[PDB]
Coordinates of C-alpha atoms and ligand atoms in Angstrom, one line a residue:
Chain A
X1 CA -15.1 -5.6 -21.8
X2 CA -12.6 -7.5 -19.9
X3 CA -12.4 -10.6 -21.2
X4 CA -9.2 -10.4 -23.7
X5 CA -5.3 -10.1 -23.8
X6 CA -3.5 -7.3 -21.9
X7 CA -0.3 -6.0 -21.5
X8 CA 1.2 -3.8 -18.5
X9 CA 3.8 -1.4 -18.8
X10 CA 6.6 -3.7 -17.8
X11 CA 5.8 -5.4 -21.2
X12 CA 3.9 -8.3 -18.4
X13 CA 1.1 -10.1 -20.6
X14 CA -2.4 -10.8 -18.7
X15 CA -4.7 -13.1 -20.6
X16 CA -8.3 -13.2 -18.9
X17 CA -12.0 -14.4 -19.0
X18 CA -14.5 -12.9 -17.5
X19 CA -16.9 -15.3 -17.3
X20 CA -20.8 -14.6 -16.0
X21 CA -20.1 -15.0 -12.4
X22 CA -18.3 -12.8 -11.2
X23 CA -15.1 -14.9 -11.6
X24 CA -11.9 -14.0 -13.8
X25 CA -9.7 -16.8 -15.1
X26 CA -6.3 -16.9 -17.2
X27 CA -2.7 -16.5 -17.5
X28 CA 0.1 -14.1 -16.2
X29 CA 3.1 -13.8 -17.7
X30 CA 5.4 -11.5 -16.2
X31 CA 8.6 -9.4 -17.9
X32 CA 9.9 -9.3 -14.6
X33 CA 11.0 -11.0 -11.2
X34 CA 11.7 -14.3 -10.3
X35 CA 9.3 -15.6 -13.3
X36 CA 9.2 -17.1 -16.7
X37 CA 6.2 -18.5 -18.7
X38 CA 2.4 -18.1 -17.6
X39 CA 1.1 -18.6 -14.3
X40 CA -2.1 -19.8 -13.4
X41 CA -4.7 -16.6 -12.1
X42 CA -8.0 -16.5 -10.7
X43 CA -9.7 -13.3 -9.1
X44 CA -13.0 -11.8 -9.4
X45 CA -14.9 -8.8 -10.8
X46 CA -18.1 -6.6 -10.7
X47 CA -20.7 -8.3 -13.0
X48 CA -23.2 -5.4 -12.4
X49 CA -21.2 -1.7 -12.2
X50 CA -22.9 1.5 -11.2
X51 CA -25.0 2.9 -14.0
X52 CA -23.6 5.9 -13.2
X53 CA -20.5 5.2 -15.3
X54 CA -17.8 4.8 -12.8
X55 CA -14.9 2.2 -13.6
X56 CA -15.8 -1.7 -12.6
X57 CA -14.4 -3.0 -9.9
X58 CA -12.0 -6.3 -9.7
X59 CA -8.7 -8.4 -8.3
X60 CA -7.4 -11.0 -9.4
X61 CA -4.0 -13.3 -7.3
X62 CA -0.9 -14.8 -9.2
X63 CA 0.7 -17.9 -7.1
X64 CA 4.5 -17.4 -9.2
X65 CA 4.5 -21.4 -9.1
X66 CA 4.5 -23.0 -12.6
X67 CA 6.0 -26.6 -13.7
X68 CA 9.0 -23.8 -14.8
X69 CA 9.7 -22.5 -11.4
X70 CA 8.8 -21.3 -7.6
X71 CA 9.5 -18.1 -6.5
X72 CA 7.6 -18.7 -3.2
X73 CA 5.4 -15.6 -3.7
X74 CA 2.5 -14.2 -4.5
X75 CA 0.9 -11.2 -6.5
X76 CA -2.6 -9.9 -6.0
X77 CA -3.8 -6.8 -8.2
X78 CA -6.9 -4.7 -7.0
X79 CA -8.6 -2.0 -9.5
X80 CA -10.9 -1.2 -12.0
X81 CA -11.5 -1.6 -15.5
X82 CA -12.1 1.7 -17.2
X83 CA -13.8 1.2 -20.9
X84 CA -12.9 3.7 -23.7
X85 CA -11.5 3.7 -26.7
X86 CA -9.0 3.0 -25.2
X87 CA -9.8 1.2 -22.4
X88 CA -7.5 0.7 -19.2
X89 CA -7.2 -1.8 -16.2
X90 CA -6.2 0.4 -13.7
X91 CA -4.3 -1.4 -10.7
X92 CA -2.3 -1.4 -7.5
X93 CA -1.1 -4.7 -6.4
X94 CA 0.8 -6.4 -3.1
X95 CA 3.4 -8.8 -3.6
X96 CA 4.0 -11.3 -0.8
X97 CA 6.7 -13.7 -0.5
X98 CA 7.1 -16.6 2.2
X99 CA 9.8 -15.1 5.0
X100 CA 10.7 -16.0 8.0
X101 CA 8.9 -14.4 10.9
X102 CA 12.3 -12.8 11.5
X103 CA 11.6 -11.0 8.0
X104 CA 8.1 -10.9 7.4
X105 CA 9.2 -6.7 8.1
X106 CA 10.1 -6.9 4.7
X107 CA 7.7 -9.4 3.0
X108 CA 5.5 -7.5 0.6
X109 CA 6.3 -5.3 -2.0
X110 CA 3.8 -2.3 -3.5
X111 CA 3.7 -1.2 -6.7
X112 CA 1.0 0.1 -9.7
X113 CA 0.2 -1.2 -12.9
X114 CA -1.7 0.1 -15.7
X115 CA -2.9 -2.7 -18.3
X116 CA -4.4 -1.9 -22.0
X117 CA -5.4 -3.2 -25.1
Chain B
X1 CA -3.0 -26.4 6.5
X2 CA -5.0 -23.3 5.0
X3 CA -8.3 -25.3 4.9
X4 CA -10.5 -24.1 7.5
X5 CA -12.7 -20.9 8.9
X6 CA -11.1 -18.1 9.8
X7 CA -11.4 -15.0 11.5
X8 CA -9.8 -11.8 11.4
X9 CA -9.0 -8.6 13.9
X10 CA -12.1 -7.2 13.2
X11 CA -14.9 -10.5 13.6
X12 CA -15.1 -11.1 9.6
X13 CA -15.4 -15.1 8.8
X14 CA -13.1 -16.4 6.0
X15 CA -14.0 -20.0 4.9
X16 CA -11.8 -21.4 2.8
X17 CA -10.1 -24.8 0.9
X18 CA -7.3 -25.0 -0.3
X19 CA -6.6 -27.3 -3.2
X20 CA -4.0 -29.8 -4.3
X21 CA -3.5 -27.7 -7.2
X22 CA -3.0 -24.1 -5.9
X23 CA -6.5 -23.1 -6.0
X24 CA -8.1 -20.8 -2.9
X25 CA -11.8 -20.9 -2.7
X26 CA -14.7 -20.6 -0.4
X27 CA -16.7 -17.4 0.9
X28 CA -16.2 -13.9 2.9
X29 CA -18.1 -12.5 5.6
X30 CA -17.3 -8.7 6.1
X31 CA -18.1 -7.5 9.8
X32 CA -18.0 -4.4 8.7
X33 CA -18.3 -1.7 5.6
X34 CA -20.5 -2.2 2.7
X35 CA -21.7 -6.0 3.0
X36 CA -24.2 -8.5 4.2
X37 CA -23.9 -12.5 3.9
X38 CA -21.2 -14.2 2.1
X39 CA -19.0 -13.4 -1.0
X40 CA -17.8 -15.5 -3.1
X41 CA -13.6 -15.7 -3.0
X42 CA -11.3 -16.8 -5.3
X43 CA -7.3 -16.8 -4.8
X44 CA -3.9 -18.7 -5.1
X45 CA -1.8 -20.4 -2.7
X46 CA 2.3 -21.7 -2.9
X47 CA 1.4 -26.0 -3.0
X48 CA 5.1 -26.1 -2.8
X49 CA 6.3 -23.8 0.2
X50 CA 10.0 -23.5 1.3
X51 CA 10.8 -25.5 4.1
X52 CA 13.7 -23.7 6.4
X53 CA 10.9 -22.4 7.7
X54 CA 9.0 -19.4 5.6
X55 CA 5.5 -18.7 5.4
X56 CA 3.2 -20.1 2.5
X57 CA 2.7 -16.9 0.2
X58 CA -1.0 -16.6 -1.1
X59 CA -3.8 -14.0 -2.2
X60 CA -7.6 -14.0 -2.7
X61 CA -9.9 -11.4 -4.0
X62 CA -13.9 -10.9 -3.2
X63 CA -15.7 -8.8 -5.2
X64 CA -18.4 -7.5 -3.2
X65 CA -21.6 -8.7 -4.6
X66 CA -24.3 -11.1 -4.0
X67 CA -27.7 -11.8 -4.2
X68 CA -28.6 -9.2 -1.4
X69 CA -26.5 -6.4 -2.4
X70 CA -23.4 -4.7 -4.6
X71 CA -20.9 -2.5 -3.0
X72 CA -19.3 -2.0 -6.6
X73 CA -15.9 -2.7 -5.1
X74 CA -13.3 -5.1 -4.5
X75 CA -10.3 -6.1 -2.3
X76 CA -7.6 -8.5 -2.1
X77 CA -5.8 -10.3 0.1
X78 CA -1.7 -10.6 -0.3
X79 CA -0.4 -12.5 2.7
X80 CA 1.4 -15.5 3.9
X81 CA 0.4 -18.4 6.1
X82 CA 2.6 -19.4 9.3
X83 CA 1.6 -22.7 10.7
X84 CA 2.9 -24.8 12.9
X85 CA 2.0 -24.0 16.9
X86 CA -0.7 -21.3 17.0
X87 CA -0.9 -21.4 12.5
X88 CA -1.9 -17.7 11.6
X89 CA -2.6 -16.0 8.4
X90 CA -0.6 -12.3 7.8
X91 CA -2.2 -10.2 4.8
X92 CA -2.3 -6.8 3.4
X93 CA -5.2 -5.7 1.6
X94 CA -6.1 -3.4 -1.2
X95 CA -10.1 -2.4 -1.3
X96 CA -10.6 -0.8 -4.8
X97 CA -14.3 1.1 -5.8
X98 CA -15.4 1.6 -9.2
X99 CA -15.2 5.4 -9.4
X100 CA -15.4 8.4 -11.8
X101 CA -12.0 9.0 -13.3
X102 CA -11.9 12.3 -11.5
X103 CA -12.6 10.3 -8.2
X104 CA -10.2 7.9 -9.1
X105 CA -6.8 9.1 -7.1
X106 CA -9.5 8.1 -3.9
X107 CA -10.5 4.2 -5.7
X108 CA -8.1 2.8 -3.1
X109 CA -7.8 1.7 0.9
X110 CA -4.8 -0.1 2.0
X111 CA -5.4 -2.5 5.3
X112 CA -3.6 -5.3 7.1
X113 CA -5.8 -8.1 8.5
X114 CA -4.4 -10.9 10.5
X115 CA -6.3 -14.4 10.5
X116 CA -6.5 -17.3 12.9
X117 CA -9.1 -20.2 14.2
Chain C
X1 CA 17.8 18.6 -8.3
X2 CA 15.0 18.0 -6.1
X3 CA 14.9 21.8 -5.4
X4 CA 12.0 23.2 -7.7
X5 CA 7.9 23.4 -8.6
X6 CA 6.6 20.1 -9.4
X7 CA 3.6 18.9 -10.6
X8 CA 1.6 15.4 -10.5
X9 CA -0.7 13.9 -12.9
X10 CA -3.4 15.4 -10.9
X11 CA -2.4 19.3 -11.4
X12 CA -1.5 19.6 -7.7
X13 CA 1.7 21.9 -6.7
X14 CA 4.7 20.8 -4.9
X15 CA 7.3 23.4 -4.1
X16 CA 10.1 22.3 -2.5
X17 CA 13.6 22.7 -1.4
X18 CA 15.9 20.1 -0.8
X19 CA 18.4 21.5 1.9
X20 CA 22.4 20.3 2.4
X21 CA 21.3 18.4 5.3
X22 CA 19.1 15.9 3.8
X23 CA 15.8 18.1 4.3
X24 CA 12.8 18.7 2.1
X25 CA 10.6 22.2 2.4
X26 CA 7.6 23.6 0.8
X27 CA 4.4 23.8 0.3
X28 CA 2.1 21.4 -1.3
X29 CA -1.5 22.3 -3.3
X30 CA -3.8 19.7 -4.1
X31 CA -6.2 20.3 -7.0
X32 CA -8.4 17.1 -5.1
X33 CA -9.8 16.0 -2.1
X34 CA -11.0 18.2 1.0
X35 CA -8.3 21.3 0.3
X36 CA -7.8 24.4 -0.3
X37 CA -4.7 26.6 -1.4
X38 CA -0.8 25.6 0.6
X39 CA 0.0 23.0 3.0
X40 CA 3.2 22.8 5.1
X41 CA 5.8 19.6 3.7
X42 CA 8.5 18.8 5.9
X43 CA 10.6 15.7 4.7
X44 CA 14.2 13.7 3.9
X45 CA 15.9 13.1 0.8
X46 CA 19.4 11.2 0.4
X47 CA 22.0 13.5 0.4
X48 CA 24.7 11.6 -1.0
X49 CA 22.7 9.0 -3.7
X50 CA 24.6 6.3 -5.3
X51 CA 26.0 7.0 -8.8
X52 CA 25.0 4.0 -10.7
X53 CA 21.7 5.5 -12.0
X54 CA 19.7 4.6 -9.1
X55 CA 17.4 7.2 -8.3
X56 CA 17.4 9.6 -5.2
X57 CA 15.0 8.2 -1.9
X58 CA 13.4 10.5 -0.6
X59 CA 9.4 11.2 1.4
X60 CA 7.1 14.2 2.6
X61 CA 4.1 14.6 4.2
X62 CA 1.5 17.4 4.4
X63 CA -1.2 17.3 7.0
X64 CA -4.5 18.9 5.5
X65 CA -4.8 21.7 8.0
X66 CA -4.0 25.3 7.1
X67 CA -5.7 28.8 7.7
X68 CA -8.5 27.8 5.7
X69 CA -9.4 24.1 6.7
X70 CA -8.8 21.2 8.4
X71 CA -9.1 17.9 6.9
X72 CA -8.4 15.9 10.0
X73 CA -5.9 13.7 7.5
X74 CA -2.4 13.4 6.8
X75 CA -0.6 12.5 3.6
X76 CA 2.8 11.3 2.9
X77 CA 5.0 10.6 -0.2
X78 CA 7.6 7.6 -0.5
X79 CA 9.4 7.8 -3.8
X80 CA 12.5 8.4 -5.8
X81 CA 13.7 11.3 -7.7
X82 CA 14.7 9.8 -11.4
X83 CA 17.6 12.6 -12.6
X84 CA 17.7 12.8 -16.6
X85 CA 16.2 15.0 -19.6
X86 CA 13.1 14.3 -18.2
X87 CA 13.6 14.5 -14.7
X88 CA 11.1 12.8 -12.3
X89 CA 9.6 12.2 -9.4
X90 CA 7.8 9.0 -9.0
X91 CA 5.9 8.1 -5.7
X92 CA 3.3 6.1 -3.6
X93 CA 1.3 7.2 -1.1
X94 CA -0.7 7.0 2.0
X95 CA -3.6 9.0 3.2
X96 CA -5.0 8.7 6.7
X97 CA -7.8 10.3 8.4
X98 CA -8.8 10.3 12.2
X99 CA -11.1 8.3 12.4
X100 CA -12.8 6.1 15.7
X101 CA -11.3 2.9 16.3
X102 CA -14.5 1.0 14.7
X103 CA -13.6 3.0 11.5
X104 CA -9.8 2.8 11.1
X105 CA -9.7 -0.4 9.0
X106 CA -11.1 2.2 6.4
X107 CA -8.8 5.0 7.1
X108 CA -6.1 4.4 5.2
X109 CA -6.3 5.6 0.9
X110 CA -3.1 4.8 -0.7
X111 CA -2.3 5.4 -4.5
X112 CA 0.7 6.7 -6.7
X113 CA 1.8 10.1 -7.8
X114 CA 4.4 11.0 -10.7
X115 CA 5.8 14.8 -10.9
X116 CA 7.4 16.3 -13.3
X117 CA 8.6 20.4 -13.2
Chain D
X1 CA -0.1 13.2 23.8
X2 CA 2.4 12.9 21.2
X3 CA 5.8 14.7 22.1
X4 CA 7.8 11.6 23.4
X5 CA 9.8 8.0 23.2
X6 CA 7.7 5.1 21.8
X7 CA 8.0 1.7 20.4
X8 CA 6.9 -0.7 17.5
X9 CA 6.6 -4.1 17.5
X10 CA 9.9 -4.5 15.8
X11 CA 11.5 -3.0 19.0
X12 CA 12.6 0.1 16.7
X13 CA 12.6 3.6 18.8
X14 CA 10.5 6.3 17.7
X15 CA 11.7 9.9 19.5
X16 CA 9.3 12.6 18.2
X17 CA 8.4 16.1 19.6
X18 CA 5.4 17.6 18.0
X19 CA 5.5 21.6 17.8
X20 CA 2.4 23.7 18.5
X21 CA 2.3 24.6 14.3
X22 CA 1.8 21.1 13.6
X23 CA 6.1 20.4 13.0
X24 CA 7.1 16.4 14.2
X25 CA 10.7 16.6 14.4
X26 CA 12.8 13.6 16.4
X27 CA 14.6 10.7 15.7
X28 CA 14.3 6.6 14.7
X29 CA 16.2 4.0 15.7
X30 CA 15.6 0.6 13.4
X31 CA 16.0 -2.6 14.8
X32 CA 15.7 -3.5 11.3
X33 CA 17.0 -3.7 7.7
X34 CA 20.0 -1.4 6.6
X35 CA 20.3 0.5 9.8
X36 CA 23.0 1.5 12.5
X37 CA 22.5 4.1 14.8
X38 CA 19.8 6.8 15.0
X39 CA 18.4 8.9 11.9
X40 CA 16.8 11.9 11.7
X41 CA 12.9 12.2 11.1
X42 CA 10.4 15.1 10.2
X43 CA 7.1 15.3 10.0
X44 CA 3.6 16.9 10.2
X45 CA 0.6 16.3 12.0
X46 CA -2.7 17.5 12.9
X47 CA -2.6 20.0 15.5
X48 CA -6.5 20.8 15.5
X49 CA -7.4 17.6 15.8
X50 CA -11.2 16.6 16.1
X51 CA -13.2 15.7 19.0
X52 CA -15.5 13.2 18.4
X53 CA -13.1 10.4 19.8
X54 CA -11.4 10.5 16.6
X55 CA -7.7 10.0 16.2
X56 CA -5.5 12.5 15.1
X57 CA -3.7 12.2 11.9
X58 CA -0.3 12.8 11.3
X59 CA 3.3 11.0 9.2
X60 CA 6.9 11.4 9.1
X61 CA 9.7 10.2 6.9
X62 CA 13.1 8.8 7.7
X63 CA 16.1 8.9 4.9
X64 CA 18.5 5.9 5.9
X65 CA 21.2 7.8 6.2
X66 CA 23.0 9.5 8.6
X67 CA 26.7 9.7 10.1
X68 CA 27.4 5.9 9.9
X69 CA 25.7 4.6 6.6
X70 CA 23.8 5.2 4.0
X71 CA 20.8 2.7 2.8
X72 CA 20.0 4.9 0.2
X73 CA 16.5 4.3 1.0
X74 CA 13.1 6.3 3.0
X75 CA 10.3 4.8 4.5
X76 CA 7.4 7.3 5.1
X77 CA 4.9 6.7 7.7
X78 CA 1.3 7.2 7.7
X79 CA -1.4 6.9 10.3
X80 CA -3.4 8.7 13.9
X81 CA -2.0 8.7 17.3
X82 CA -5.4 7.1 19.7
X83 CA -5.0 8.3 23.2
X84 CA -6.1 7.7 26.3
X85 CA -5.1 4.8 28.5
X86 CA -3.9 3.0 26.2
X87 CA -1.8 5.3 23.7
X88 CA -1.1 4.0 20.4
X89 CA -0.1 5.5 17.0
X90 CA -1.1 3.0 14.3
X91 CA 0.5 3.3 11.1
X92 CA 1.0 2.0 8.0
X93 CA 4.5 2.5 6.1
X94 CA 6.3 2.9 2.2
X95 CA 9.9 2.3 2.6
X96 CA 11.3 3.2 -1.1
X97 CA 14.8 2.2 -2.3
X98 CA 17.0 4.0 -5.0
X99 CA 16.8 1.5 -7.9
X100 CA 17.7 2.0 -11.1
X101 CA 14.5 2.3 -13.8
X102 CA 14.7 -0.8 -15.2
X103 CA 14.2 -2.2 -11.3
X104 CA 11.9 0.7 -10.3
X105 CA 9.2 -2.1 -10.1
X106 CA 10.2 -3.4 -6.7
X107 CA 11.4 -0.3 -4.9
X108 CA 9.0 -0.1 -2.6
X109 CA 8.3 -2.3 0.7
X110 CA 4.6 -1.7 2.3
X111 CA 3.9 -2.7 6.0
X112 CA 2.5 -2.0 8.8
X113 CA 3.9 -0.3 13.0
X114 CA 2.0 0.0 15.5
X115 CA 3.5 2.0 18.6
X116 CA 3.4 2.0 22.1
X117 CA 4.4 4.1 24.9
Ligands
LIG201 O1 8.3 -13.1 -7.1 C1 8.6 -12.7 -8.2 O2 9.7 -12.0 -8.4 C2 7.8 -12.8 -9.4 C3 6.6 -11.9 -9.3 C4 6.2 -11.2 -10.6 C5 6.7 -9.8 -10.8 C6 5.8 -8.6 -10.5 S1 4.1 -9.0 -9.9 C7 3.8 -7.2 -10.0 C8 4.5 -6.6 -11.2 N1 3.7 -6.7 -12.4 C9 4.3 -7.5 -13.3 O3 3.9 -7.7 -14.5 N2 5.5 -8.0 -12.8 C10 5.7 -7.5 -11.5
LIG202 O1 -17.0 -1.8 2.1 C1 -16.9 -2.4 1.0 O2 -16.5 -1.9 -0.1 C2 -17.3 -3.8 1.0 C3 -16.9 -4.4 2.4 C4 -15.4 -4.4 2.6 C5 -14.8 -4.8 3.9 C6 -13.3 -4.7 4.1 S1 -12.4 -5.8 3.0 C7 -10.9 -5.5 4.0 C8 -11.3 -5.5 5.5 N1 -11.4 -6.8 6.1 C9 -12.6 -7.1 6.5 O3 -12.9 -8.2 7.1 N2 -13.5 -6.1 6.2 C10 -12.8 -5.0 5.5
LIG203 O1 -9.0 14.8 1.0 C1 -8.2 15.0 2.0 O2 -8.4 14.4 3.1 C2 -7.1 16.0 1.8 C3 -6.6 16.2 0.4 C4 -5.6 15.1 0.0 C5 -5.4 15.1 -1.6 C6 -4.6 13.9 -2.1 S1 -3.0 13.6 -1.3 C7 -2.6 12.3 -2.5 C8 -3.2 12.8 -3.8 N1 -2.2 13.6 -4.6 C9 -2.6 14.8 -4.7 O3 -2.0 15.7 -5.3 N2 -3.9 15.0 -4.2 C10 -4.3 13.8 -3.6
LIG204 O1 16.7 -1.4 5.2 C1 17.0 -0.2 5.0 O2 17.1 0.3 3.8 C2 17.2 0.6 6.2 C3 16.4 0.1 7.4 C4 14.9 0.3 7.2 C5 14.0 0.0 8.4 C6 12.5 -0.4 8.1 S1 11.5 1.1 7.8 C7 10.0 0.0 7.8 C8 10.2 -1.0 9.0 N1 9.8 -0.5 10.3 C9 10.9 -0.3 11.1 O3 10.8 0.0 12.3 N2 12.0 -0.7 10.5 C10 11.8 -1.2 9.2

């Protein structure tokens, strides 16, 4: 169910596989920030949900470092994919970038983004 | 560098290498909540930090199962390294469950752990 | 325009009444969680927002005792009120409960509300 | 224990007096960011707290403005005052900028206060 191409509501596109460990691989490419073309990710994921029916858990980190440019920051998104007809990856993420210790105050930015099909 | 064990406020061990190419991986050890053993980790570091003096921005994510047990949940890591004298690891943390959609507005913790040797 | 009833995307009630001195009032009803009918809000809101379309800054917070209960938690709202056709409020927000000391790195639920009237 | 003067980490001054209905009314000082001067606060927290050694919940906001400038800006913290010898309220904070829509992506700043007497 995860592995595929996704787009957030910034017009961002997440490519991923899912592959049989646990582990989630791709690209990000995102509409926004100090970015342009796709950026390595890795994260992980819950290869064996509740039978229950709840959403499956996963996270997956974005290093904005390409051979493009370095924004000296990074993303990480923690959620859960939600199946459906139209199925959602539901997310919050954190948004680190190096500061100084004078600054670190005012390192991370919070935000929420919903990815579909 | 960011290669090494480490250990956060509350006793959990994060073992960790850092490659050439950006990549975070090694294992979790929670201390506390819903988990036994190691985790698997994946995550993404800056290879090319600033150098007036900023942290190195990076994330991970563990997915909270193993062979002995499935918390259906992840978190992640957003944080940046500060080396040097005393080198120290500052995150933030989002802990997502896999949830009912009903149950989803409570998916979520937010955290900060701090890391060091 | 902050002054009116809102709703989220949960169902939950926010009355409120932004005063000339840069205070928020009301009452707040969640339709979730470990509640029951009106909650106190006490906030801040900009008075005097810029005029280049930025939104309004503004922040509450209810904590979950009344008459009826008492969740031994406290809520609060960081957001912006977004003026237009369809005017909105869009927020994060974080949800801590007493706990001990051995359980506070799991106190802590954050997510994101939107309102609308 | 919490009517009072108290300090973060960031050398900021917290002034609060908490009412017998649950009311936190005082003032903030930042020795951070786009800040001059004191600002008001309001807030709630949990007058009925429990007592199994648990902490006692409460927030408060702060608009960044007041007689000298304007940041158009609130932060909004979160968290439970721990008593005893060694008095602390731990909290974790949303400070959210005016922006306009197209920017509403990083409005918000995420950290973390604790504060002593
Ligand atoms: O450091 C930068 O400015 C680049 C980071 C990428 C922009 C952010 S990451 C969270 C959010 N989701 C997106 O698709 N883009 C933004
Ligand atoms: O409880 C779960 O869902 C699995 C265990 C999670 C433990 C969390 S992750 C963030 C924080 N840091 C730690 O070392 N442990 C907790
Ligand atoms: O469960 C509790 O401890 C008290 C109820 C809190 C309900 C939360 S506050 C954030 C979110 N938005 C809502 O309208 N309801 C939930
Ligand atoms: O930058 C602004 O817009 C005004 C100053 C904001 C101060 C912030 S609020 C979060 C953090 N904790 C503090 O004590 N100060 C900063």
């Amino acid at each position: 169910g995860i592995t595929g191409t996704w787009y957030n509501q910034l017009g961002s596109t997440f490519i991923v596989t899912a592959g049989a460990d646990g582990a989630l691989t791709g690209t990000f490419e995102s509409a926004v920030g100090n970015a342009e073309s796709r950026y390595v990710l890795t994260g992980r994921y819950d290869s064996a949900p509740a039978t229950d029916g709840s959403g499956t858990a996963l996270g997956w980190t974005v290093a904005w470092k390409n051979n493009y440019r370095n924004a000296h920051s990074a993303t990480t998104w923690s959620g859960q994919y939600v199946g459906g007809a139209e199925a959602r990856i539901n997310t919050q993420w954190l948004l680190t970038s190096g500061t100084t210790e004078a600054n670190a105050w005012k390192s991370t930015l919070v935000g929420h983004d919903t990815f579909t099909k």
